[PDB]
Amino acid sequence: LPTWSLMRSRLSLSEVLDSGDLMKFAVDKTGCQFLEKAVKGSLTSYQKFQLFEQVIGRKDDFLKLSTNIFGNYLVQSVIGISLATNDDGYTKRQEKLKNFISSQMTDMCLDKFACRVIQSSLQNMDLSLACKLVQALPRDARLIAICVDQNANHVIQKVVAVIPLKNWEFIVDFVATPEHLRQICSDKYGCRVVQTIIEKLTADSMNVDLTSAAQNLRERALQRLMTSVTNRCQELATNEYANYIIQHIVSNDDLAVYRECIIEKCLMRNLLSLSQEKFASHVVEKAFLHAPLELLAEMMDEIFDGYIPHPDTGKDALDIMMFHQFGNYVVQCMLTICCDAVSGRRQTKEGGYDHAISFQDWLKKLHSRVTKERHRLSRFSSGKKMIETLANLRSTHSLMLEPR
RNA sequence: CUGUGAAUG
């Protein structure tokens, strides 16, 4: 810290701005707190002019402060003041700030601190200028690195949240490329980007404000991304991170038409295998909970009768799943769904049929199996829940098998 | 006999 300031209580902001030493204060733990308090006061027109010039008016200083642990806060603060100061330099200032960021977009996105300057600009700038920042995003392998970066992934998520889809449609098609989807989806941060894109592309209650034309644009982008997801959903559903994306599609009511596509193309005929997977068993659970009734019947039939019992012991698919360390959560789900249906906590009407009598059949199968195996089941936390679940109803009312 | 997901003072 410069010696002429040592920090005196009578230090004024104008002193700091006039001295040429603002960069010294801005990168200093104590000096930045002074500037943070100062710029919150009633600034004269010239004080603002000096701040605009010295904080967001000089490209190299702007980058040094934006990439600084303390200076990035001063940058965001001055950006806010510049956007709130509607003088005759307003248009020029915002244009220059867009140019500074655009010219260093990728490096700023990857920086722990400068990515906060990006996000604050995206949501605070006038929409027309914020859309220009989005155009400065890269389109090659650097975009993959941005989506899987611990910092830069939040830049993409911010774009998706505050910028209309027309501006970032290239990101949807970039992610949907089979080679790119595999890399991004199986990453801890990339999977958050994909899930955030899917939610923004959903016609849920947070998109009812869209015009018809923007709804059509959203629907077409959703269909392109859903095609790539459902094309490698088996790989996605078993992955430690991408299984959350499959769960989200299967469980979200506003993605109903895709839940049936995912179930039929990925989970059907693989329920026994996927029920024994650490990550995919959660997907199977969601599918049972949310499947349409016509499909749920096929899923139940696959568990009860889709596999040939073991030729030596007679162990069948239900026995494997009911006692498996992950499969038991699927069987519990099946039992809970049936008990909810017969007790009235779940409706049973679909497609012109009443499937009440079908839930009765599945419950009777499960009750009969649980009754016969009650002694083995009573050893386990899962078995005790299943027994308890059936008792509450009476009061009120990886090994593979040969598939069929 | 219980079973998995984000980066600044």
Residue numbers in the entry: 168 to 173, 179 to 569, 607 to 613
Sentences from the paper on this structure:
To explore possible roles of the FBF-2 CT, we expressed and purified an FBF-2 fragment containing both RBD and CT (FBF-2164–632). We determined a crystal structure of FBF-2 RBD + CT in complex with a cFBE RNA (5′-CUGUGAAUG-3′) at 2.1 Å resolution. The electron density map revealed new density, not present in the previous RBD structures. This additional density appeared near a loop in the RBD that connects repeats 7 and 8. The sequence of FBF-2 CT residues 607-613 matched this new electron density, but other C-terminal residues (aa 570-606 and 614-632) were disordered. In the FBF-2 RBD + CT/cFBE crystal structure, the seven visible FBF-2 CT residues (SLMLEPR607–613) align structurally with the core regions of LST-1 A (residues 32-38) and LST-1 B (residues 80-86) and made remarkably similar contacts to the RBD. FBF-2 L610 occupied the same position as the key leucines, L35 and L83, in the LST-1 A and B PIMs, and like LST-1 A L35 and LST-1 B L83, FBF-2 L610 was seated in a hydrophobic binding pocket formed by the Y479, L444, I492, and H482 residues of FBF-2. FBF-2 RBD residues Q448, G478, and I480 contacted the peptide backbone atoms of the FBF-2 CT, LST-1 A, and LST-1 B. Thus, the FBF-2 CT contains an intrinsic PIM. We propose that the FBF-2 PIM acts as Velcro®, attaching to the RBD and constraining the disordered loop to be located near the 5′ end of the bound RNA where an electronegative cluster of acidic residues in the CT weakens RNA-binding affinity by electrostatic repulsion.
